[PDB]
Structure formats: structure tokens, C-alpha cells
């Protein structure tokens, strides 16, 4: 079968905790030396993945001491030891030996207190009117927890069509989250109404944090 | 200085194939197992197989044999992965890793990854929008500045501000795709102290399409 299975998929934890991570194979894995070839990598967003354990219990130079590995025959652990807010990503398990299999992977996430979003909104540019389209922007940065709802107002009128949302991947010095939310309307639609508004709402309150302007600046 | 140095970006059409590269430099070449690897997101990292440069000795997942070709040439240093028959299962960042012995046993030295694209979409540049705040009392102590970038294709884009100078407060969001067309975007906060009595500009490259644009951030009205 040799399949390598994590457990489990997604590891909140909050700063200072012990972490710890499970990977088994459906087979026993020692090598015929004695030997069992089983690494931890870890990948964060933006970067390539990078060796933190080599058979099953060595540190790779540069890895801090609070990462130690262990296990034996289809039992293997990686054990965070008082985590901290740059460790968060996704940790693979990774069998080197005969056909080389990874492991489905642990996303590491930092719980912390709720954080409110500083919100920030745009108007569209001279330049994007110029071709004949109009995207109203809204920034809602550093909050927590992650999960937020934007709400866009045309005129005091609710508008939920033609928004693109986007989320940052947790920071790793604050754990908190960012989002962006893009209304995008014909230069035409815009210029028929004068007040644009961007409201999140987050647990941080009962009241929504709104945040707008007027065409008329 | 161990390095593994990857191709750049591909975007190919459903079907076809693709060849990047793996260029090694700072050790003996042909005394490692070289090995690639695939991220496509949503599936995690997937082992596609190795090749022995010294004499090109391959070893491939049951998954992808007929569907990757490993080579390599030893007086280039070079090692390289072909994919056939693309479909858009293979989009992903493709990864190239060195496999240590000695002072370490597995995978310890990575390339930066090629990505790439499969799709009959036509390759767009990036329209990028400079954000202003729209009134000046929607400014206070600090300021939060910002460049859209739309219509793009294939992805990716990268963006820094003031040539790099400027990294402190800023938010670079992961791309959306919309009907063909790329859409992210990326904040920054800075004094109002700094702007706009200091010049800001957001730099945005698409090497996808050879192509750079570089925004100043100027107040409206």
C-alpha cells in the first residue's frame, strides 16, 4: 500500500503551545541498512520547500532546536516545541526510500486575540477610466480571525455582483490576515452615482467598519 | 555555494509539451540523484522522479511515467524535465532538488521552481492602476497607498515598491483569474510624513510577456 498519511490536515495552535504532527505509513519502512529515510520539509508561501529532519530524528543545519523528530517502523512524529509566530506553514512528511512518496502535508496556523481591520478605500484611476472601466478598491488589513465578510455600498444601495476578493496568507510576525475587495463596473455604471462604500464585517463588533467616498472630491 | 537555478515560466497549449531546466553549479554534478518535484495547489507536493547525471539512470512514480522525461547533460551541468500531453491537471510549480549523502540524506538543495500554465488563453500585460487616497481628509498620521493590477495573463506577476526600498507595510494579495484575465493587487502604509512629500512607485514585472510597468502614486482631484 505505502501510502503516507498526515495527521492531521490543519494544526491551529496558539504561540508558545507544542505542536505536534503525525505521519504513518500503511507499511513498515526501514531500509535494509537499518536505516529509515524519512524527512520533514517545509514549504511557506512564496518560497520552495526546504529540509528541516532527515532520518527520522536528525536536524538539518539552520533548523532551530524547538523541531525534533522521531518514530519508528510506520509511526513518525515532528514535535514543535513552544511555537512562534514564523513557524506557520505547510509541513510534509517524505519517504525517501524506494519510490519516494510525500505525505499529504500539515497546514501549521497561529490562533491569537481578534484584531480589528484598518480599512482603507480607492477610487478608480484616471488611467482605468480612461479605457472605459471603473474598479472601486478596498483594503482591510492586519485583523483576525481570518474570517471577515466585505460589503460594497453604491449610493447607500447594496451591491454584491462583480467583486473580487482576495485573502493574505497568514504574517508571520502578527498572525493576523489581510484582504482585498475590488468592485469593478463600466466607467459609465460609475459615473452615475456619487458615494461609494466598503463595510466589513468582522466579530471584532456589532457595527461594521465602513469606509467611503464621494465623486465629488 | 550549492545552486539550482530553474527556467522561467511556460504557458503552453492543452496537448502540447514543454522542456525547463535545472542548471547546478557549486558541487559535482554528476555524483547526485537529482529529483523533481510537483506543487500544484489544492494536491500538496507530488514526487515526480530522479535521474543520476553520471549516467542519466532514471527512476519514475508509476503517475507520471509517460508523461515526464528526465535528461541531463553533464558539460552543461544540466539537468531537465520534458512534459507531454499537457492538460490542465499539469499546471503547477515544478521543483528540482538535489539529493544529499555524506552530511545529510535527502533532498537539500532546491531549485526556485518553474511554473507552468496550460491553456489556450492569449497572453496578456498587466494594466496597473495606481490608488490614491480619494480625499486628503482620508489621510491622517499614517497613509495607505496601493496598485491594482488587471487584465494579466498567464500568471504570474511580481511587485515591489520603490524598487524594493519601500518593503515595511506592505500586502501583496494572491491573484484571482476571472475569465482568462489575472487580477491582484497590493497595498502599502507609510508615513504621511513620507507622501506625498516622497515619491512613491509600485513596480510591476511580467516576464511572461517581457514586460514592466512602473507607477507613481500621485495625489487626486
Known amino acids: 500500500d505505502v501510502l503516507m498519511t498526515q495527521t492531521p490536515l490543519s494544526l491551529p495552535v496558539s504561540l508558545g503551545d507544542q505542536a505536534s504532527i503525525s505521519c504513518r505509513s500503511s507499511?513498515?519502512?526501514?531500509?535494509?541498512?537499518?536505516?529509515?529515510?524519512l524527512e520533514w520539509y517545509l514549504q511557506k508561501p512564496g518560497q520552495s520547500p526546504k529540509l528541516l529532519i532527515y532520518?527520522?530524528?536528525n536536524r538539518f543545519s539552520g533548523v532551530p532546536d524547538r523541531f525534533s523528530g522521531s518514530g519508528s517502523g510506520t509511526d513518525f512524529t515532528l514535535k514543535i516545541s513552544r511555537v512562534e509566530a514564523e513557524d506557520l506553514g505547510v509541513y510534509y512528511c517524505?519517504?525517501?526510500?524506494?519510490?519516494?512518496?510525500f505525505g499529504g502535508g500539515t497546514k501549521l496556523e497561529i490562533k491569537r486575540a481578534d484584531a480589528a481591520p484598518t480599512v482603507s478605500i480607492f477610487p478608480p484611476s484616471s488611467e482605468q477610466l480612461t479605457s472605459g472601466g471603473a474598479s472601486v478598491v478596498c483594503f482591510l488589513n492586519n485583523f483576525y480571525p481570518k474570517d471577515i465578510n466585505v460589503k460594497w455600498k453604491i449610493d447607500g444601495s447594496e451591491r454584491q455582483n462583480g467583486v473580487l476578493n482576495s485573502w493574505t496568507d497568514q504574517d508571520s510576525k502578527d498572525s493576523t490576515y489581510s484582504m482585498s475587495s475590488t468592485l469593478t463596473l463600466t466607467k459609465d455604471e460609475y459615473e452615475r452615482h456619487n458615494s461609494y462604500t466598503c463595510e466589513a464585517t468582522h466579530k471584532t463588533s456589532t457595527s461594521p467598519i465602513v469606509k467611503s467616498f464621494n465623486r465629488n472630491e | 555555494e550549492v545552486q539550482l537555478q530553474q527556467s522561467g515560466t511556460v504557458l503552453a497549449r492543452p496537448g502540447a509539451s514543454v522542456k525547463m531546466s535545472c542548471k547546478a553549479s557549486?558541487?559535482?554534478?554528476?555524483?547526485?540523484?537529482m529529483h523533481w518535484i510537483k506543487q500544484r495547489p489544492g494536491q500538496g507536493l507530488e514526487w515526480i522522479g530522479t535521474?543520476?547525471?553520471?549516467?542519466?539512470?532514471?527512476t519514475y512514480s508509476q503517475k507520471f511515467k509517460g508523461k515526464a522525461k528526465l535528461t541531463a547533460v553533464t558539460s552543461t551541468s544540466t539537468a531537465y524535465m520534458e512534459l507531454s500531453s499537457l492538460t490542465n491537471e499539469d499546471s503547477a510549480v515544478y521543483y528540482c532538488?538535489?539529493?544529499?549523502?555524506?552530511?545529510?540524506?535527502?533532498?537539500?538543495?532546491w531549485g526556485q521552481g518553474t511554473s507552468v500554465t496550460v491553456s489556450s488563453a492569449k497572453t496578456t500585460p498587466p494594466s496597473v492602476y495606481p490608488l490614491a487616497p480619494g480625499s486628503a481628509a482620508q489621510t491622517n498620521s499614517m497613509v495607505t497607498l496601493g496598485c491594482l493590477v488587471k487584465g494579466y495573463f498567464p500568471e504570474p506577476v511580481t511587485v515591489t515598491w520603490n524598487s524594493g526600498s519601500l518593503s515595511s507595510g506592505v500586502h501583496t494579495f494572491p491573484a484571482v483569474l476571472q475569465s482568462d484575465l489575472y487580477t491582484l493587487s497590493s497595498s502599502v502604509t507609510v508615513p504621511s510624513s513620507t507622501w506625498p512629500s516622497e515619491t512613491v512607485t509600485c513596480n510591476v514585472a511580467h516576464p511572461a510577456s517581457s514586460t514592466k510597468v512602473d507607477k507613481k502614486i500621485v495625489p487626486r482631484d
Open positions: 532520518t527520522v530524528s
Open positions: 557549486g558541487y559535482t554534478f554528476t555524483n547526485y540523484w
Open positions: 507499511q513498515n519502512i526501514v531500509h535494509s541498512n537499518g536505516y529509515t529515510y
Open positions: 532538488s538535489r539529493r544529499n549523502y555524506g552530511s545529510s540524506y535527502a533532498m537539500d538543495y
Open positions: 517524505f519517504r525517501g526510500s524506494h519510490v519516494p512518496t
Open positions: 535521474i543520476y547525471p553520471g549516467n542519466s539512470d532514471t
